[PDB]
Structures are given as C-alpha cells and as structure tokens.
Amino acid sequence: NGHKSYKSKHASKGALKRLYKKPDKQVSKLQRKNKAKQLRAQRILDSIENRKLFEGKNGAAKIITIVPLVNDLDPLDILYKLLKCADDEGIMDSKRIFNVHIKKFKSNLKIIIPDMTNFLNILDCAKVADFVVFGLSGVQEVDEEFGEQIIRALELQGIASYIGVISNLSAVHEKEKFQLDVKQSLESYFKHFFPSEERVYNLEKNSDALNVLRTLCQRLPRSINWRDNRGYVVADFVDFVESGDLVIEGTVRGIGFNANRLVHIPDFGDFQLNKIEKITVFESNMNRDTLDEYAEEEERQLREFRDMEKEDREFPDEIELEPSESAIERLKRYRGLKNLYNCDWQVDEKDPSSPAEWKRLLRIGNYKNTKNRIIKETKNEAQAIAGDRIRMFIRFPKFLLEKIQDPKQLLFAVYGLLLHEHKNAVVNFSLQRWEQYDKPVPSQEPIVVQYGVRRYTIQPLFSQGSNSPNNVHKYERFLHPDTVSVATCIAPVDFTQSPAIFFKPSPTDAKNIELIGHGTFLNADHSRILAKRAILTGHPFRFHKTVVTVRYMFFRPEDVEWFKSIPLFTKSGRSGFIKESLGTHGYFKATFDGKLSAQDVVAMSLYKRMWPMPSLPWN
RNA sequence: GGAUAGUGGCCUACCAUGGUUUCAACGGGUAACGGGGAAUAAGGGUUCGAUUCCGGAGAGGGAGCCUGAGAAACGGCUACCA
RNA sequence: UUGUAUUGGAAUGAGUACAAUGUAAAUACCUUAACGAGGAACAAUUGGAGGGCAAGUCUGGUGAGCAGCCGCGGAUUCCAGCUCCAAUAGCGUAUAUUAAAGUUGUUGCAGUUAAAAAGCUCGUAGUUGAACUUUGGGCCCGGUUGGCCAACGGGGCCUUU
RNA sequence: GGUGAAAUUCUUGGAUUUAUUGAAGACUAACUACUGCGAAAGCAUUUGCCAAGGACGUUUUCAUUAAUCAAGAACGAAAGUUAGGGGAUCGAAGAUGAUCAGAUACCGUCGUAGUCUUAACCAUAAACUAUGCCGACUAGGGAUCGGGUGGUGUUUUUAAUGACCCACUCGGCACCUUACGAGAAAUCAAAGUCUUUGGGUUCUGGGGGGAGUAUGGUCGCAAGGCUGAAACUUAAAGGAAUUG
C-alpha cells in the first residue's frame, strides 16, 4: 500500500464494521464458609461408605497370607507371635486356613498359609490376599535362586498390600546395637523392592507386634485392578451332588456375580453355574451365554539356536540359494515390496496357509471403547455384592472329583469371567526379558504364559514395536537382546489388560520353572499384519560407466527374468534395478544411483505373510 | 429514680432535636489475633510475623448459674442444637 | 631442585573393648590396657561440556530425542565409551518472595512520531502564593586546641533598647 | 443528451439553440495571502440599530483581591430524532437503462428522507500544532499586522489631517540561518537551562492478544454516550533511518 496506517489502542468502529460477519456474583464470607462445610460432609460420608464392609463381626473378613522367604523360619512362629498380642488366649489346628475374631479390635481375620513346596501354589495363594506378610530371617539371608524369585514374581502380578516382618533377630544377640546393625541392613534390602515402605517390624518386641496387629485390623488395602473388575469368592466349604453339581459357600469380594455368567477355576477351566442363593435363590435362566469356544540330544537343539541367533545378529534375514535349486519353487510365495509401511497388504488374505478359523474368530476394533463399555454394564447387572454370604451350584464333571482337596488344607478359589473372554481372537502382548535371562529365544518355540488367573501354552511370533499406518510389521526370528517387543498369537481375550508372565517348565530346577520374561496384554488386533522379510545377496564383479554386472544371486536366466521387477539396493544405500539376463549361468547387469565397487554388496528384499498359531490350556 | 464494687442511656419515666461525613462517614472484603521481631545490607524501601517473651480470646455450637477474695470455669453443674 | 612408573619403613581414627569418669540410674562425649589398612574393597557423590556460562575439530551408533531462552537433528547440542569442568558430605528440581530493576519512580520513570495531554471555557473542596519592621559599632570576661599568640566557640555591659 | 462505446429519455403540436420579460429558494466567485477575529466548534455583498472584546496610551483609582483545579455548570462540525414552515439545486433509499470493452473497469435517467428555517433533543471527528496551564532565563536576521513617539523627509494645499519614507518601542500570526544545548533519529528557540537529577499545579500510561467484549450503574424518545474486568493465550509486537 505505501501509507502509514492509523493506530488505536482499541478497534475503531470503522474496523469493527468490516470485521462483522446472568449477573456476576460476589462470594460473601458466610456462603464461602457454608460451601466448604457441606463439601466436607460428603467426604466424610464417603469414607464411611468404604469402611462399612469391615465394620465388625457382621462384616466381611480380611484375607491375610504369610510367606516366609527362608525355610529356616517356619510360618507357625510368625502367626503365633502375632496372636499373643491379641491378649485373648481363647484364640490360641490340623489345618492351614484359620478364621479368627479379635475382640481387642472387633475385627475378623482369615489366615491362609501356602505349601512352600509348591512354588505355583504360592502365587495362587498370594493372588487373592489383601495383605501379604513377608517373613525375613536375621540369621540367613535370602537366596537368589528361590527366595528373591518369590518377591519378583509377586510384584509383577500385583499385590494389594505388603508388610515386612522379622521374628528371630535375638538369635544373633551380643548387644542390641548388633541387632540394630542387622535390622538396618534388612530394611535397606527390603526397600529396594518396596520403596513405599521404610520400616520392618521386630516381632520379638511387644510394641512392634502390637503395632502390626493394629494395622491389619484397622487399615484398608489397595485395590487390584484386573481382579476387582471380576467377581471372586473363597470357599468356606465344598459339597458335591450328581455330571456333578458342586456346591461352594463363601463371600463375594469382586464387582459381583450374576447367575447367567461363566465361572473359571484356575486348575480346571471354565464351568457354568446353575443356581445362586443368599445365606432368596437365583437360578440360571438359560437366557445366558454358553461354553462354546467359537462363533541328552537336547544339547544339539540348544547349540543350534545358539549358533543360529549369533548368525542372525550379524546378517539378519540373509538367505543363500544353491545350484540346482529353483528360485521360483522355493520362493514363489514371496510378494516383494518397496516398503512395508506403504504396501497395501490385505489383512484377511485368502491364501491357503491362513488359518481355517477366520470368520470363526472374534474381531473387535476399538478395544478401548469396547472394554469400558462392557464393564459399565457388568457392574449394573450384578446380583450379589461384596460381603454377601452366598451358596453357588456349579455343573462339575464328576471325574475331576479326584482332584478336589479339603479347602481347610489347600486354597480353593473361584473367579467370574467377562462375557466374551471365552472366545478366541488374535491377541497382542508386550514382552521384555526377565532379570538375567540371556538364553536365546526362538520365535516359534513353545512357551507357557500366565495372564490374570488362567495360563496357556503359546507359540509366539516376535516383532519390534512401532506405529505403522497399516499395522504391517516385520516378523523376527529371535527376541532382541535388549528392547521391549510385541508378541502375537491366538488366545482367549482379556478386557482388563492383565499383567502377563512368561516362563518354561523345567523339572530339573528346584522350582520346576524357568523364568523368561514379563509384560502386558495390549489388545486384540487382527490388522497387526506380520511380514516375513528375506534378503538375497550377490557380488558385483565387473564395472562400467553406465552398468554393473553381478554374480551368484541367480543361476538361471529364467529366474532373473521372473524376479526382474523388484528394486535393488546396496547396503551402502544406493538403489538400482535389473536390466536383463546375461548368458546362461544367470548373471545379470544392472544400473544404480551412482558408482559401486567390489567392496559393496547388492541385495534385494522380499516379503511373505505370516499367521499366528493357535494355543491350548496348560496345567 | 433503679441497678452496680463504683462512674456513665447501663436501664426506666418525662422533655428537647440532636450526632458523623469528600480531611472519605456508612457499607463490603481479608487464604487478618496485635506487638517485641524475621529475610533482603549503598541510601530510601519491599515482603513476612499460626510459632520460645508481653497482652487478648476459646475449650463441638449458643444460653444460664452455684461455690468463692477471685470464674459467667468446661480435667464444675443445668437446658436446648449437632 | 620439578614431573612420570618398580620398591621400603613409619604414622593414625573409623570401629570393637577391660576400667574409671559421666548420670536419679543409664546411653554418648572427654580419658585409656588389648585388637584394628596397600588395589590402604576401610573404594564420595550431584549436575554439565554451541552461547548466556567453567570445560571436547575425541570416537562408535542413529537419522526417536535435547532444549528455562536463542537453537541442534532427515550429530561439537540425541544415545554409548573415553577425557575434561564446577561445587563437595553434600548437590539438583518445583512454588512463593527479595536484590540486580530507574518495569511503581519522595530520593528516581514516561506522554510530537514508540503505551499515555481530556473538544473548549468557567468554577467549590485540595495544593500553592511578591517585597518590607534592631542593623551596625564599641568595651570586659571567657573555655578548647595548637604554638604570652592564633583559630574556633560562649557569657556580660554601653550605643534612644 | 451521455460515454471508453452505447441504450432508457425528449422532439415537425417544433426538442436543443436565439430574443424580450417574470417567479422561487439557496449561495456570496475573481480581490484571497505562509494576512485578520473568536474559549473551541468556527467566521467573507451593502446600510442601520443593540450589546460585548483585545492591544496601546495614562504622574487616575482599590490594595493581595492571586495560579491550577475532583464535584457542579455554559458552548460544542457533519450525520441523526420530534412538531410547524419552505421545498430552486444536489441527492443514502427506491424504481429503472447497458452488461459490450482493460487507461478512460463502473457509467445513464427519475427521485423520497435530507440539504434551508423556527421550537426542543443528541454530545460524537485524524474535534490534529498528533506537543496541558502559569512564571523566569538563554542567539543572529529582515519581513508583516494593530497602537504610540520622533524627523529641518516626499506628496495631497497656501494648515491640520490622510497616503508614503526613515529610526525607536509594546503586543501578535509566521519565516530564514546557526546549535553554546538536546535527541533513537527525523529533527527542535524549545522538544534547551537533567545521573552536575527539586519554580507552582491538573490529567494519563506500565509487553502483544482476549476487549472497548461480559456484568453492574447512570444519561437519552431512539440511535447510542460515560464508567469498565477476568479466566485463557503468546516471544515478541512497535519507532526512526540508510542500504544490498
């Protein structure tokens, strides 16, 4: 324009015309104060609503579990020293589950003791507790091969709350300052796993043991997310009726139960309940979901994986052809692509190696908007709720009766399923290695995975994590030595994103188990296409100002012609293309972005579709 | 005139029409107990003081009262509200 | 007489402990017989290395990370290893406040063109308001400080008082 | 007739043009400027009446009666509102002609309200010298407006007066040169007498947006005027000057 324009601190009316196309309240001191008071009334009423569940003998019991980390201890010493401070000897037998009422704190406690021989039974016991009491020895320090693995495993499945306890520190008395030196060491060790806690009690002192007892009675535990969104109960008694109709009585602790649900027992699988009653009766009204799943030579094997993984780490996906081998018949299935992130590979491809189940598989899409929606309905439909004394009748196959034990001697526990979780789908897991598991893991090798209560034998497929616009990703032969990774298989879905633990059975080990890794249920996503990449390679050997010719990549003129269209690249990063076959031995000549030399190598990439394998329960 | 340990609209009867204010009355706000003091050093200032000493107020919220030289007391009593 | 590496005697408390002392009784400090260092493993951390702002043309990887601000990266600024810098039994971060700040200005800001002189004049409260009345000159006493003397202070009398 | 070109329109009952006369309403050319007056808005034909004002002259009179100013008050271009008058010209709205053409690219005909005036309202402008009022001091020069003093000066005549010339002086609108001074620079006789910081006094500002918005109040018949936030967002926005 060329003119110094007009200025004003606020817009002129001329400017506004071109651009074109209840009372406020003062808070008086009284009403300020009044609002704060009536807000506090809500908070206080809300705190009562939480606590009523534990309020007394009429309320629910709190579930305590004792876990000694050293066999030196004997768990009966732990419990006995606690019971003394209750100051009622009427409290203080051929059994490992105990119900106690404490007059001193008007509190109901259930104590469960696991059988320390059965490592897997420890996890199952601790999985249901509100409080886990860790026993430590002042005399002998925990062993890395067993004692620590208890702590590490419990953390990764999740713990409602934890207490550190000592019971025998006087066994190293000279002066109690020497006891304090040891106690400081144990606290520093314990805090490494549980940095929220800074105290370990000495039960040899009356003041500490009373302090522990008070806490168990008075304080509330944390919730466990994946558990409390389901229902669960612990059996007070079990009974059998005629193929069976197994009866359990106990207390509701989760979100709740409905007689039309499905019920999982961790050792035995899914079963249907037929009736419920409250200690009114509820019956399975047949407008219900149903039980349908659809609609020394080993040294050579270990050495093989050790050698193969070392090779794959140096020269990944490189392949050797051989003379008298047809490249077509070997490789015709491979499509060949410029870039996985840009290819239009179809998900539910019709190729014959695709599993027989496809329409048979459940597919969800928006897992997030599915998960939260399902829960909202489930909590509304609950019939029995926390603290209800209940009986339940369950369709129980009579031949499994040989596996039942008296619940007074062994933990028997019951979990409700979410509706579609019985159906199989494509599922995805995060995975990273256990604390020092340096062994090679082959992508096809079978593994046992626990996630939530249930556990399955799985053969995975490994891939790296990224957000490709098409969900196509490279299949990988072995688990990366360091990064987190994504593993894919077919299994029954979980909506709660339970933590997952990865291990392999090994009865040669003291705990019968070898621990491999941990992770999380990410999602069901069938679009998570895996492509098996292959690299062929050949040697450029003669060089001209406009073309280079390459040996050994192919051995027949017919093969050079059939694969002519796939682009070439150098590992030094130049691209190129086949011109034509030269001669009968399968030489070719090619053009590239620039100068090559015999110190470079010429490669080409090809890709094949992969599909997940199915999986089966484990016990 | 009554009442009080005692002065005084402190209260009662009768009578007069006064009292404060742009030198900011009256009203509203304070995550406001006051002071000795604390931090920050060119000088002038700015910000803070629930808290070891001095003074005031209260004992879940309002009101009433016995004993005693002294209390409108709450590790004294009586009633209502929660 | 100063640096860089194989080798030798000396020195000591952290810690433990007989005893005495301490204390209402004790613990600890102060004192002390015995024991107590060679990778003296009896092993010091917390943040940084483009500029503001002390200190890397080092070297390997990569093409999500860093960054109060300016900026780096499709690599002196990312990640890893060497080396180097700063404070050190302490060092970093968040929020509030003070100084540097003459961005609240009494001391001490600014208003043509950068934020800011009201269209114009009258006028009450408020702030502010020309000059003038005993001035000068004598004579005693006189304290302090430094060389009878000088300076600087103070009291009395006379002159129309 | 009108345009870049053309059409609507008027005309052989005579258009446009020429001559002799008359009516109405508005306006005050040239003279007219680096000139005058007024608190500002603003003010231009002649003569009469009414009342007011600055500067100058003064050996008149009173004797501190003064300067600035919250509240309160008078005036306030153009457009706009209500009622009466007037109604030439031009002309928001409205009704109409062409829709072709790149310089003439938005043009032609008719025409309501309005434009003027009387009696009441409204209170805005780039209302600008973009510079608050009162008082003192600091530099050179030749022009001009109003008053006064002097001259043995020219002219109107044989005085006075008037016109002109020369010197001085009070007051005013401006201009040219310079910078002891000042400033970011353009520039400035004040925008000087400031880190060497104090003559009196009124008003306003505190990075850019949200915003002259929301809400409350108050004035107006209405259009609208005055007063006037915060949550949130952002690293610049802005001034002067030269140059690739």
PDB file of N, CA and C (backbone and C1' of nucleotides) in Angstrom, chain C residues 136-151:
ATOM      1  P     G C 136      24.161  43.201  61.484  1.00  0.00           P
ATOM      2  O5'   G C 136      25.057  44.493  61.711  1.00  0.00           O
ATOM      3  C5'   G C 136      25.750  45.099  60.636  1.00  0.00           C
ATOM      4  C4'   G C 136      26.225  46.484  60.993  1.00  0.00           C
ATOM      5  C3'   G C 136      27.351  46.567  62.002  1.00  0.00           C
ATOM      6  O3'   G C 136      28.608  46.277  61.428  1.00  0.00           O
ATOM      7  C1'   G C 136      25.708  48.116  62.590  1.00  0.00           C
ATOM      8  P     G C 137      29.801  45.721  62.337  1.00  0.00           P
ATOM      9  O5'   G C 137      30.084  46.909  63.352  1.00  0.00           O
ATOM     10  C5'   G C 137      30.590  48.146  62.885  1.00  0.00           C
ATOM     11  C4'   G C 137      30.753  49.131  64.010  1.00  0.00           C
ATOM     12  C3'   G C 137      31.651  48.672  65.133  1.00  0.00           C
ATOM     13  O3'   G C 137      33.019  48.775  64.793  1.00  0.00           O
ATOM     14  C1'   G C 137      29.712  49.669  66.038  1.00  0.00           C
ATOM     15  P     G C 138      34.124  48.138  65.757  1.00  0.00           P
ATOM     16  O5'   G C 138      34.174  49.156  66.969  1.00  0.00           O
ATOM     17  C5'   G C 138      34.666  48.748  68.227  1.00  0.00           C
ATOM     18  C4'   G C 138      34.225  49.687  69.312  1.00  0.00           C
ATOM     19  C3'   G C 138      34.635  49.284  70.716  1.00  0.00           C
ATOM     20  O3'   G C 138      35.933  49.754  71.009  1.00  0.00           O
ATOM     21  C1'   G C 138      32.329  49.718  70.693  1.00  0.00           C
ATOM     22  P     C C 139      37.087  48.720  71.405  1.00  0.00           P
ATOM     23  O5'   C C 139      36.698  48.340  72.895  1.00  0.00           O
ATOM     24  C5'   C C 139      36.837  49.302  73.924  1.00  0.00           C
ATOM     25  C4'   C C 139      36.219  48.814  75.201  1.00  0.00           C
ATOM     26  C3'   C C 139      36.716  47.471  75.676  1.00  0.00           C
ATOM     27  O3'   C C 139      37.994  47.553  76.276  1.00  0.00           O
ATOM     28  C1'   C C 139      34.364  47.580  75.890  1.00  0.00           C
ATOM     29  P     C C 140      38.758  46.218  76.722  1.00  0.00           P
ATOM     30  O5'   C C 140      38.102  45.838  78.116  1.00  0.00           O
ATOM     31  C5'   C C 140      38.283  44.540  78.646  1.00  0.00           C
ATOM     32  C4'   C C 140      37.273  44.223  79.711  1.00  0.00           C
ATOM     33  C3'   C C 140      37.225  42.758  80.129  1.00  0.00           C
ATOM     34  O3'   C C 140      38.145  42.476  81.168  1.00  0.00           O
ATOM     35  C1'   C C 140      35.066  43.447  79.508  1.00  0.00           C
ATOM     36  P     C C 141      39.191  41.266  81.029  1.00  0.00           P
ATOM     37  O5'   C C 141      38.301  39.966  81.238  1.00  0.00           O
ATOM     38  C5'   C C 141      37.755  39.688  82.515  1.00  0.00           C
ATOM     39  C4'   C C 141      36.589  38.740  82.440  1.00  0.00           C
ATOM     40  C3'   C C 141      36.896  37.317  82.011  1.00  0.00           C
ATOM     41  O3'   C C 141      37.388  36.504  83.062  1.00  0.00           O
ATOM     42  C1'   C C 141      35.030  38.100  80.813  1.00  0.00           C
ATOM     43  P     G C 142      38.451  35.334  82.753  1.00  0.00           P
ATOM     44  O5'   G C 142      37.735  34.418  81.658  1.00  0.00           O
ATOM     45  C5'   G C 142      36.646  33.566  81.991  1.00  0.00           C
ATOM     46  C4'   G C 142      36.006  32.973  80.759  1.00  0.00           C
ATOM     47  C3'   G C 142      36.934  32.209  79.821  1.00  0.00           C
ATOM     48  O3'   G C 142      37.104  30.842  80.132  1.00  0.00           O
ATOM     49  C1'   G C 142      35.816  33.836  78.582  1.00  0.00           C
ATOM     50  P     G C 143      38.333  30.366  81.046  1.00  0.00           P
ATOM     51  O5'   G C 143      38.431  28.807  80.749  1.00  0.00           O
ATOM     52  C5'   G C 143      37.357  27.924  81.032  1.00  0.00           C
ATOM     53  C4'   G C 143      36.846  27.262  79.773  1.00  0.00           C
ATOM     54  C3'   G C 143      37.869  26.454  78.990  1.00  0.00           C
ATOM     55  O3'   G C 143      38.057  25.171  79.555  1.00  0.00           O
ATOM     56  C1'   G C 143      36.601  27.780  77.502  1.00  0.00           C
ATOM     57  P     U C 144      39.415  24.358  79.309  1.00  0.00           P
ATOM     58  O5'   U C 144      39.389  24.025  77.753  1.00  0.00           O
ATOM     59  C5'   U C 144      38.556  22.994  77.244  1.00  0.00           C
ATOM     60  C4'   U C 144      38.667  22.900  75.747  1.00  0.00           C
ATOM     61  C3'   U C 144      40.066  22.598  75.243  1.00  0.00           C
ATOM     62  O3'   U C 144      40.341  21.210  75.253  1.00  0.00           O
ATOM     63  C1'   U C 144      39.076  24.337  73.953  1.00  0.00           C
ATOM     64  P     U C 145      41.855  20.685  75.244  1.00  0.00           P
ATOM     65  O5'   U C 145      42.399  21.130  73.817  1.00  0.00           O
ATOM     66  C5'   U C 145      42.174  20.340  72.663  1.00  0.00           C
ATOM     67  C4'   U C 145      42.732  21.021  71.443  1.00  0.00           C
ATOM     68  C3'   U C 145      44.220  21.291  71.504  1.00  0.00           C
ATOM     69  O3'   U C 145      44.988  20.130  71.258  1.00  0.00           O
ATOM     70  C1'   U C 145      43.093  23.170  70.616  1.00  0.00           C
ATOM     71  P     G C 146      46.525  20.071  71.714  1.00  0.00           P
ATOM     72  O5'   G C 146      47.268  21.067  70.723  1.00  0.00           O
ATOM     73  C5'   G C 146      47.583  20.678  69.397  1.00  0.00           C
ATOM     74  C4'   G C 146      48.057  21.856  68.589  1.00  0.00           C
ATOM     75  C3'   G C 146      49.360  22.479  69.059  1.00  0.00           C
ATOM     76  O3'   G C 146      50.507  21.765  68.633  1.00  0.00           O
ATOM     77  C1'   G C 146      47.779  24.179  68.676  1.00  0.00           C
ATOM     78  P     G C 147      51.981  22.299  68.990  1.00  0.00           P
ATOM     79  O5'   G C 147      52.235  23.474  67.948  1.00  0.00           O
ATOM     80  C5'   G C 147      53.271  24.424  68.155  1.00  0.00           C
ATOM     81  C4'   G C 147      52.876  25.782  67.633  1.00  0.00           C
ATOM     82  C3'   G C 147      53.963  26.845  67.676  1.00  0.00           C
ATOM     83  O3'   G C 147      53.718  27.809  66.652  1.00  0.00           O
ATOM     84  C1'   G C 147      52.225  27.430  69.179  1.00  0.00           C
ATOM     85  P     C C 148      49.301  37.394  80.254  1.00  0.00           P
ATOM     86  O5'   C C 148      50.356  37.270  79.069  1.00  0.00           O
ATOM     87  C5'   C C 148      49.922  37.177  77.722  1.00  0.00           C
ATOM     88  C4'   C C 148      51.074  37.276  76.757  1.00  0.00           C
ATOM     89  C3'   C C 148      50.728  36.994  75.292  1.00  0.00           C
ATOM     90  O3'   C C 148      50.497  38.192  74.576  1.00  0.00           O
ATOM     91  C1'   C C 148      52.391  35.482  76.016  1.00  0.00           C
ATOM     92  P     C C 149      49.136  38.415  73.758  1.00  0.00           P
ATOM     93  O5'   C C 149      49.270  37.449  72.502  1.00  0.00           O
ATOM     94  C5'   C C 149      50.194  37.738  71.464  1.00  0.00           C
ATOM     95  C4'   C C 149      50.213  36.644  70.433  1.00  0.00           C
ATOM     96  C3'   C C 149      48.867  36.345  69.806  1.00  0.00           C
ATOM     97  O3'   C C 149      48.540  37.255  68.773  1.00  0.00           O
ATOM     98  C1'   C C 149      49.989  34.323  70.358  1.00  0.00           C
ATOM     99  P     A C 150      47.012  37.430  68.312  1.00  0.00           P
ATOM    100  O5'   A C 150      46.660  36.085  67.540  1.00  0.00           O
ATOM    101  C5'   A C 150      47.048  35.888  66.191  1.00  0.00           C
ATOM    102  C4'   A C 150      46.648  34.520  65.710  1.00  0.00           C
ATOM    103  C3'   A C 150      45.160  34.247  65.761  1.00  0.00           C
ATOM    104  O3'   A C 150      44.453  34.843  64.693  1.00  0.00           O
ATOM    105  C1'   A C 150      46.330  32.384  66.602  1.00  0.00           C
ATOM    106  P     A C 151      42.862  35.016  64.790  1.00  0.00           P
ATOM    107  O5'   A C 151      42.300  33.538  64.638  1.00  0.00           O
ATOM    108  C5'   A C 151      42.383  32.850  63.402  1.00  0.00           C
ATOM    109  C4'   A C 151      42.024  31.402  63.580  1.00  0.00           C
ATOM    110  C3'   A C 151      40.576  31.175  63.967  1.00  0.00           C
ATOM    111  O3'   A C 151      39.725  31.165  62.840  1.00  0.00           O
ATOM    112  C1'   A C 151      41.964  29.943  65.412  1.00  0.00           C
TER     113        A C 151
END
